Amino acid sequence: EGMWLMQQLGRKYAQMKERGLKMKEYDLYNPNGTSLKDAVVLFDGGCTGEVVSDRGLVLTNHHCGYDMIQAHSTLEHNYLENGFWAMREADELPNKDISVVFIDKIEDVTDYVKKELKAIKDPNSMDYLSPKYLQKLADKKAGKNFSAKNPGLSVEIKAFYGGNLYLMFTKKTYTDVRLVGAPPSSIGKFGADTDNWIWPRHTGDFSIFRIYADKNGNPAPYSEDNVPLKPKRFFNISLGGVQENDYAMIMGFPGTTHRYFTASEVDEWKSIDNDIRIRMRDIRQGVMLREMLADPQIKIMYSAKYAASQNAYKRAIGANWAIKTRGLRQNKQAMQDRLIAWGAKQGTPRYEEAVHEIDATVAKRADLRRRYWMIEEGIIRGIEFARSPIPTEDETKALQASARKEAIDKIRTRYSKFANKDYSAEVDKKVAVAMLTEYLKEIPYENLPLHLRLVKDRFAGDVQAYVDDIFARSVFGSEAQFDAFAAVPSVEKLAEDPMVLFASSVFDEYRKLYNELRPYDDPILRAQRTYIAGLLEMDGDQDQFPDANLTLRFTYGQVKGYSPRDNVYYGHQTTLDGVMEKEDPDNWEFVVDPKLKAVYERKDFGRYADRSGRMPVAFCATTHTTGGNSGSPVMNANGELIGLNFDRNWEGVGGDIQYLADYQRSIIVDIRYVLLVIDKVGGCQRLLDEMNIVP
Amino acid sequence: DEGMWLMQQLGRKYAQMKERGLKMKEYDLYNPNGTSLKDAVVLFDGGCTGEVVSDRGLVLTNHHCGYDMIQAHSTLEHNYLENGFWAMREADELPNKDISVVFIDKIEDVTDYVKKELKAIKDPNSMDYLSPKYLQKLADKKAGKNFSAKNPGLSVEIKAFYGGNLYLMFTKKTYTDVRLVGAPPSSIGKFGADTDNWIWPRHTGDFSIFRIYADKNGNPAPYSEDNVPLKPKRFFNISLGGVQENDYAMIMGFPGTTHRYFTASEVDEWKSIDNDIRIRMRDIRQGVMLREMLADPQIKIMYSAKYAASQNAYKRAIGANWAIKTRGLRQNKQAMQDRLIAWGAKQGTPRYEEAVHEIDATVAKRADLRRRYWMIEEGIIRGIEFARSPIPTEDETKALQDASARKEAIDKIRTRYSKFANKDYSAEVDKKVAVAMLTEYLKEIPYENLPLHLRLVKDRFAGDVQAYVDDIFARSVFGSEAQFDAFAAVPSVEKLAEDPMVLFASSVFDEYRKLYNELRPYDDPILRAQRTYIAGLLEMDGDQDQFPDANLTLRFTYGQVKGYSPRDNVYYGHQTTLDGVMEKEDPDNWEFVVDPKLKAVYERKDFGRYADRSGRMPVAFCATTHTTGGNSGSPVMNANGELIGLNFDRNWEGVGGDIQYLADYQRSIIVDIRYVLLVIDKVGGCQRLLDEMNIVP
């Protein structure tokens, strides 16, 4: 049910042993020694990874290493489509802008931070959550020049439980992290966007990297003189596999949760955030899909844009399903009524006042929040010409010296990036007509961005005519129209350009709404500090975990399937047979790698198949994970690596607010399948030899 | 494989059924010389099964079987299709026109008689052995002089089985006064609508209730206000004990057709011609239709039924091709015929190998013709609506060529035009469908094999299909109402003779009939060789583990209440519940609307004695019984012969079961009788129906 701080291992250890944990507490997390925690990394700021060899080999997801695979791919050596297998350490590819972060030490600095905060003065100060204020406290505690005295190390203080607990982390960051191996995208991204958030799942979502360091194993930027890191801890790989009900645990960096939402915040998340995102993206997606199905060239240009819109659309559908069917609002209401009754009994009304402040703030900002989501989903992300070029102040106060040619060249560059190889003005006009029709139905005239008032005033309510006029008269409406402008440019032409005026008006309204809504966050945040302090004082810090905040957490559970609906069961494990069932040669998402299809036909599974002779692919577990946990190590009762977390089923996306024991699962790639791919698909035996594979 | 057994075969199957869980005495299920449970089973309205469930002739069948009778009695004031219908007294039950229930009074083996009569052979290749006319002459000869007049309500019929190796005479008792008694609302009766067609898990309460009325002596009589409910020989007791996983289940009913004795070459033909062409052509038709329905809400209303009608056999063909591809249907037919050929060689009789060779050679010879026939039937006859536009009859052309006979012919042509261009017809949707269908048809069918008018696409329109279709509508008398009216004011045979739409329709129907006539002779050598083929299979492996193909005659099948795994890591259990209906509820989707009385019953858990041991309300279950079209409404029995449900569908994964039963995938989809009784009770409030049934604990 939770995402526990490493400090909370002591408090959860007995229950973990009762559930099947076999390892000693300090072998998993030792606060003043080496433990399994030292083999877990924050991979490139937004993923988890794990060290799996005494020479710094790192496993993470294929979707986590995707950008590094794509950046090294060319027409001659397309690593993204065929995979990549460095047959020697010297062939491993360096990556620019990459990092791996180790959590060297974790310290409770609550008393220190709370004492420092007493010197504020303004009781409503937000310094208690400010990264700048907390960094000043971290630097004061670690010492003026800590990083010079301790190379590779840095300190950081974060707030937890809404400001009721503070932890200081001593981090060790390595920036020379090289690409070692990756399966073809047909394996790494098998279901592609069709199987996103889906269980059963058949995706071998893994990639392999290596941490390089100086001669003393200290962090160093890329240098041909760097040598592999010899880590103090790395995971052993288990080949014992998994069975239904086996104990499983994860360590990783979950990004965000909202476990302490009030019932009013759940209602707002549903009726504003989710319903608007669902409604607006369903309109955008429908027009886009119609156009992609009618023209194969439009399908190529808009596939990525369509997939990018669908991902959070599906998440919002899954989240709304939990709100509707799993009683999220009711359980938050019961949580807050229980605190209010307890507070009345203690003679302390501050908890009821805090819940009241959150409800009143949520109620006050509703119309503004609705207008913000409507414009952001409807126009800012909904219509491509909303992000068309807007002449800067430096460009207009240059057009009206011969820096006129310099202003036009910069405007041309931005026009070329807007009307790129994947942009269709015809597809965009059709999407805009549908999006704006919905937006104008929902947003009243007095709340419209200035230019959109012209639909009623100038175009007699004709949305199609308004959009047609924007393109017919705009300098960014076509290449010929831009070139005619570029030959005789004037600031007067730009000032009255219908596309410039649209883009400017909608961005102006978007920024105005953001600025008016931003002050409402602070009273909610301050009242949450009181609210969570009351919940902790009442029911204790053991059942209620602190919200995720991109810090190292552990979660535990079992390898277990679930029933998604009446008379349907999805088991705990998928097999290579399921990959073959899904094969579709005329669907790029479900193409099966020929080497993998051959391995399946010959049953060349070696030591990786289960006792039945079937080849495992993926499994699911009752662990509590969220975005940030991609690539997390999945451990046995013995702490051995049994898989990598790579996704979570859509039925459990509401788990960020309330864990759903009967539906929510972590989707994990079986480590036996990872080794099978390295071995029979990549032929990279050296990686198998450097890992410590236990029977 | 797990057959549709003749009633005659119950004796030789009985021991295995007892070992599988059957508890009843053999002759209580079927006795050729006296009353048995077989007497409570009826052929409901020619194409469904039904069952007698009371001593006053009450009949249960599917909602989709009684659909036309419910719809015919529905009005704007009393919409029984939408809200259901519950007659609170026998006098309120609604009579139905053109309805029948058929009882199988007696079944007799007449093989020796038919085979002796057939020996008077004037031609060894005669097809009289399969002719309904010839067999009726033999049935009338055996039954006697004016049997139907001496035994009113009874009729005699002989059917061939095992390709002409076995003949049975059936004495049927037909009742035509069958009245509507009760029906749940469509929201329960057809809950999944076409979305859940062929789907398991299933949550549809697919039942309707009728009553057989008869004269004072219980003899068949047409509708009369003097008719009294029938007192039957036998009726089913209703069980409330429910079902559990692995329970024995059996069905009696009228499966229509199977092809269990196809050669491997007939499986290849069914896949590569019949199914692939139907799939490819309907996918094109459906895609254009769906795009037009999604863009215009009025087109969606006009084309929903046409779209659903095209999709039903499209889905069946997809399911059947999945079995051919993944379940080894072709290979198992090949093994069946190689085993017979090896045995025949050992017996010194080459006639079985010669028979299989004749079927293969005939299948190979007709391939191009069969491909051209399916291409035109799926592509144009079914695919393009203006293919069924009006064609002036010979008598209409003669009438239009001096007299008032001219205006009579024009009125007749107008009537047919009005039926073609009706409230659901869109010429714009039809032109778009035709352009796509014809583009595919012209790519597949060479110029020399095209219907005469379609040659104009290359000759006159320079390969432009859109221009050809545009010209048909712009210049045709049936292209629009104003164009028809201009013709009707000044009509001439000359205008009709050169009309592009008339010429198109005439040419495609001419080609369709020519292909049918050229292909028809190929059926006879296959049929005669199948008589030899099946005789060999029966002589070799006996009439014990190979059932005769279904032919709309009474059969029994047995199995277990059991779910299945449709794919890797997925399991569908044996039973669905009312909870699953609630999970599927969607008020803005007519297909998944939930009746308020039913939703309230679920909320209050007002399930009474009908609920399972865990307090869950059962809805439907699935079984390993072998059923097909014709089995809709069939009684599902317990090990004791008590009614536990009604068969109403089969999952798409098992549609290949008509050729080869699929033990691990094929299931009969059954409405739980506890759910039927719950709906009658808590939704209909028709307590009198519960009281007349014999409900056992």
Ligand SMILES: Cc1occc1C(=O)Nc1ccncc1
């Ligand atoms: C009803 C159903 O049956 C199978 C899948 C679904 C479904 O809703 N899928 C889904 C929902 C949200 N995001 C992604 C996928």
Ligand SMILES: Cc1occc1C(=O)Nc1ccncc1
């Ligand atoms: C068919 C079904 O519907 C709801 C649940 C199930 C089911 O099979 N459950 C199950 C199977 C295996 N392990 C654990 C539980």
Ligand SMILES: Cc1occc1C(=O)Nc1ccncc1
């Ligand atoms: C692969 C699959 O998963 C769920 C359903 C299907 C499917 O193909 N359904 C279907 C096929 C043929 N006729 C009817 C329905």
Ligand SMILES: Cc1occc1C(=O)Nc1ccncc1
């Ligand atoms: C076969 C299968 O694949 C994935 C899950 C299952 C499963 O649960 N099987 C099962 C459940 C209940 N009774 C019998 C079998």
Ligand SMILES: [Cl-]
């Ligand atoms: Cl380290």
Ligand SMILES: [Cl-]
């Ligand atoms: Cl012979």
Ligand SMILES: [Cl-]
């Ligand atoms: Cl099977």
